[PDB]
Design a protein around this ligand. Structure first.
Ligand SMILES: Cc1cc2nc3c(=O)[nH]c(=O)nc-3n(C[C@H](O)[C@H](O)[C@H](O)COP(=O)(O)OP(=O)(O)OC[C@H]3O[C@@H](n4cnc5c(N)ncnc54)[C@H](O)[C@@H]3O)c2cc1C
Ligand SMILES: Cc1cc2nc3c(=O)[nH]c(=O)nc-3n(C[C@H](O)[C@H](O)[C@H](O)COP(=O)(O)OP(=O)(O)OC[C@H]3O[C@@H](n4cnc5c(N)ncnc54)[C@H](O)[C@@H]3O)c2cc1C
Ligand SMILES: CC(C)(COP(=O)(O)OP(=O)(O)OC[C@H]1O[C@@H](n2cnc3c(N)ncnc32)[C@H](O)[C@@H]1OP(=O)(O)O)[C@@H](O)C(=O)NCCC(=O)NCCS
Ligand SMILES: CC(C)(COP(=O)(O)OP(=O)(O)OC[C@H]1O[C@@H](n2cnc3c(N)ncnc32)[C@H](O)[C@@H]1OP(=O)(O)O)[C@@H](O)C(=O)NCCC(=O)NCCS
Ligand SMILES: NC(=O)C1=CN([C@@H]2O[C@H](COP(=O)(O)OP(=O)(O)OC[C@H]3O[C@@H](n4cnc5c(N)ncnc54)[C@H](OP(=O)(O)O)[C@@H]3O)[C@@H](O)[C@H]2O)C=CC1
Ligand SMILES: NC(=O)C1=CN([C@@H]2O[C@H](COP(=O)(O)OP(=O)(O)OC[C@H]3O[C@@H](n4cnc5c(N)ncnc54)[C@H](OP(=O)(O)O)[C@@H]3O)[C@@H](O)[C@H]2O)C=CC1
Lengths: 444, 444
């Protein structure tokens, strides 16, 4: 009867909705550290660009709706500081009054997600230096753009947020610099595919600095320059975009197993090693369909899927999580960047014998007007020909191809089986053989 | 050593390429009735609209290449009138000189496709009455549009060609009427999905006449009117697009088995019941993955796949055709119309117990600008929940959804298994749950 959920977003509320719909008698307490429930973090870069009117448009479901319509005891400003798994008590500190509140549970879900990482650089706390995770985070970025005269913008880290925010700031008309400590931006992509990302960024006059290490942020009350090991550069706004960390530190003292990055280990049923404690979303581990191992690939699709499943399993409606494929898709200027399954570094690290096929193709019939280039790469096992992963880059029809590849990986298809699938063709949408099929035909 | 192929397009030449690549000692003779090899029939409507420069842009590989580069004895203007399967001789008539040539085979492939049907209406031979199949057919339509004052166009038959050519004629600024003997245009769609087709046509001022039967075409030399059982209407150009018939009449007297419509029955290996005689493409039957019987769904994707497989099997590189799903996609004005697997009429005619789910959704995140409506319907087995079919209609993202559904059907997935697939999400491409997955969740 007593369900407690820590975290009031994708994984947490997906679980809450399951419990509420499938048990009329349940007492559901959800504990949220912030003031905002069920909101779309994915839309934040597009609010900051001005493409979306305001952050209000990103709220999927109000806390008032959760309380009045679904009878969930949804708490805001309740930060969980510790859990006693023997007594089955959750301790939450009110973020403003600092008052401490106890919540006894029969079953507990941890759905605290991840937080962005800020390294211990000098200048960390300078005005105009920003992380991006929450709605207040985006408002603070908008506040800087509103009050300051922003011309030069520097982004540290060339992963998912870095890439999307590089677009956002270019669209806002700023001079954009990206600094990455690795060999290239779009680190999940293989060296060969990443060249297309670099080209697109260069095309829009984004300065890319690679194998370069941030030293400090210099400035007065506010950030003025980013210092690195190779130079000092003017920056009116700095976005720090260097990765994330599971919000699981408050579990120190429990016997709850975590991986090396602090992600909570879960079995097929979203259960931790501690009786009646569950975890879901970005704070938990994610079984990988292809790796056959628990990975950590924090993403919104997986968070919702895991949250829904945790809720179901907490009700003893037993259902296994089938896993992640590491699917990811990004809009980057005029390019769509998509990947799923293993890249070459992942396959190598696993000692899986693999081969690759790469095709420079078009999204649709070559003779049809405004047919655009499509670059597609597949990895497959050299012995069994099992499809392992894909990377697709292009202006159009990239999401379609990565979704088809994802379906193939999910069903453990051989690369040559792709040739036999009755995919759709008309001139405005595809070629008579899809690029995926033409790649498959090239495979050994 | 002696391979003979009848028909020089998609299925025939896919076969020819396989044989030539996988047997240097092969003597490949291909016999084509017309003057044009390997061309894209799919691009015909877009040549007529003027979207594509000319019909020359539709040739994939010309006869000179086949002859010079690949060593295929590719014959033009050779119409096969008879096959003696006992003596293993193909008899062909030169279409100009009418002289008779014979060709000895070790293995034979029939790849003669289908022809458009012209019912025996009075005035069917009038100038301005057109069928659409070949490049010359398209040039004859362009001849009428050029040399004659065309303002009113009547299309008979509301299927694939009728729908695409309605767009073409509207885009050319004509007053378009289409006449269907059935209850609605886009007959393969269920009644409820067909409503979206009617709305789009109505929006663009296409007169749709339903349950109406053409009886004659009126005029002196040219058409000036179409007579029906419900009236007589002015028409300066008439397109007859009422279906197709397999080009298999010349086989009467061979023992080669055909279905009721005249399509050549083939086994898994593209083999007929007659030793060393093969068939592929639109002239052949198509094993249906879901129906589990041999169907006839003539389409370019299937023709290439079967052509390729016939070539391979004629070399004794044994490989089974896995089947068709009945996948089809059509651009219709502002709409994209896609279907795959079973519709309700098919499921009913097969006595497969089924249920449906229909979702009115968006192609991408609802909060993202220019998110467009997406209408999606799934059929699934009542007992096992096996996915059976899908229909998707919308302005954007329809091809992606039907390809995912096709992949699911190919792998015999349960409808609820769709919930577990790590499909891609970013706001410009999808919602955090894809519409297919939301539909799947609604299923019983
Ligand atoms: C800029 C940006 C763009 C993104 N774009 C995409 C995209 O395009 N596609 C996609 O699939 N994903 C995207 N994501 C990722 C996606 O938004 C997240 O993976 C998803 O929100 C994770 O859901 P969750 O419920 O596990 O964690 P969260 O959504 O982070 O929810 C965790 C909640 O727990 C609360 N919490 C933390 N600690 C405590 C505590 N001690 N006590 C009480 N409450 C606590 C937090 O306040 C937070 O609200 C994006 C993320 C960002 C930041
Ligand atoms: C307007 C139009 C649009 C289309 N759009 C699409 C689409 O968007 N997507 C899609 O997948 N499909 C589409 N198709 C269908 C696709 O083009 C065909 O299914 C494909 O061409 C079939 O290939 P085939 O080799 O079996 O038959 P065909 O391409 O018709 O080839 C048969 C050949 O055999 C020859 N022949 C016939 N009889 C004899 C004989 N007795 N002796 C010698 N030669 C003979 C014919 O001249 C012909 O060249 C479209 C078709 C049309 C007409
Ligand atoms: C044009 C046509 C002859 C193509 O034949 P095809 O065999 O499919 O294509 P190609 O001859 O280019 O050869 C492709 C093969 O070469 C291989 N290949 C192509 N480029 C390669 C490369 N760069 N490196 C390695 N291999 C390559 C492919 O793997 C493929 O191998 P497979 O045949 O063993 O699977 C045939 O499709 C046709 O006649 N079509 C008519 C037009 C049409 O399709 N109409 C219907 C439209 S609706
Ligand atoms: C908003 C949120 C609470 C949605 O919860 P949800 O349970 O997925 O969705 P709903 O509460 O609308 O309920 C959906 C259920 O109702 C059913 N349903 C919905 N509409 C229906 C209809 N018209 N007819 C019949 N059934 C319907 C569905 O079948 C589904 O059933 P299931 O849960 O048993 O599979 C949750 O996703 C969330 O908190 N999200 C945060 C925002 C987010 O997604 N962020 C990450 C972005 S990267
Ligand atoms: N469309 C989508 O799928 C989107 C998803 N997201 C979500 O947000 C999460 C986090 O995004 P993000 O913050 O970009 O994290 P990412 O891991 O995606 O990117 C961080 C990048 O910064 C690099 N980096 C680390 N330290 C430094 C440093 N000191 N100097 C320069 N570069 C450094 C990392 O390299 P290294 O490997 O060496 O650490 C990595 O390449 C994602 O996992 C995803 O869940 C966000 C936006 C869009
Ligand atoms: N994008 C794509 O997938 C495209 C594919 N094609 C290919 O071309 C082939 C043939 O297309 P098409 O010619 O349109 O054939 P279709 O079967 O697609 O459509 C013909 C329609 O005309 C109807 N009809 C039959 N007789 C009459 C009549 N006397 N009066 C009015 N309507 C009548 C048929 O109904 P009924 O069922 O009762 O006979 C049917 O609805 C397709 O099978 C496909 O292979 C062509 C264009 C686009």
């Amino acid at each position: 009867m007593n369900y407690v959920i820590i975290g009031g977003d994708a994984a947490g509320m997906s679980a809450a909705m399951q419990i509420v719909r499938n048990d009329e008698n349940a007492n559901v307490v959800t504990l949220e550290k912030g003031e905002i429930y069920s909101y779309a973090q994915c839309g934040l870069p597009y609010v900051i660009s001005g493409a979306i009117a305001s952050t209000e448009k990103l709220i999927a479901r109000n806390v008032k709706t959760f309380r009045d319509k679904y009878g969930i005891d949804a708490k805001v400003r309740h930060e969980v500081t510790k859990v006693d798994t023997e007594k089955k008590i959750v301790y939450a500190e009110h973020t403003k009054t600092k008052d401490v509140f106890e919540f006894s549970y029969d079953r507990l879900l941890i759905a605290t997600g991840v937080r962005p990482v800020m390294p211990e650089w000098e200048g960390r706390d300078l005005q105009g230096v920003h992380l991006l995770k929450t709605i207040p985070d985006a408002e603070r970025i908008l506040k800087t753009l509103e009050t300051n005269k922003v011309e030069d913008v520097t982004i540290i880290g060339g992963g998912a947020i870095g890439l999307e925010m590089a677009e956002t700031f270019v669209e806002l008309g700023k001079k954009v610099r990206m600094i990455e400590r690795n060999d290239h931006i779009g680190t999940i992509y293989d060296g060969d595919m990443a060249e297309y990302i670099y080209k697109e960024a260069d095309k829009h006059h984004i300065e890319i600095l690679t194998n370069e290490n941030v030293k400090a942020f210099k400035g007065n009350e506010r950030v003025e320059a980013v210092e690195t090991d190779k130079g000092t550069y003017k920056a009116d706004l700095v976005l720090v975009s260097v990765g994330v960390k599971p919000n699981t530190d408050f579990l120190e003292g429990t016997n709850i197993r975590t991986n090396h990055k602090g992600a909570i280990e879960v079995n097929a049923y979203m259960q931790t090693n501690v009786q009646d404690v569950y975890a879901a979303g970005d704070c938990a581990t994610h079984y990988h369909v292809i790796k056959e191992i628990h990975d950590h690939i924090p993403i919104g699709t997986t968070a919702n899927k895991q949250g829904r499943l945790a809720g179901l399993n907490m009700l003893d409606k037993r259902r296994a999580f089938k896993g992640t494929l590491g699917t990811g898709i990004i809009k980057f200027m005029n390019l769509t960047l998509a990947r799923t399954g293993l890249n070459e570094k992942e396959a190598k690290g696993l000692h899986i014998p693999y081969k690759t096929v790469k095709v420079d193709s078009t999204n649709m019939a070559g003779y049809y007007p405004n047919a655009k280039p499509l670059y597609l790469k597949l990895l497959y096992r050299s012995d069994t020909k099992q499809l392992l992963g894909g990377q697709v880059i292009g202006e159009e029809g990239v999401d379609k191809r990565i979704d088809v590849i994802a379906m193939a990986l999910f069903n453990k298809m051989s690369i040559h089986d792709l040739e036999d699938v009755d995919l759709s063709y008309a001139p405005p949408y595809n070629s008579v053989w899809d690029p995926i099929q033409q790649a498959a035909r090239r495979a050994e």
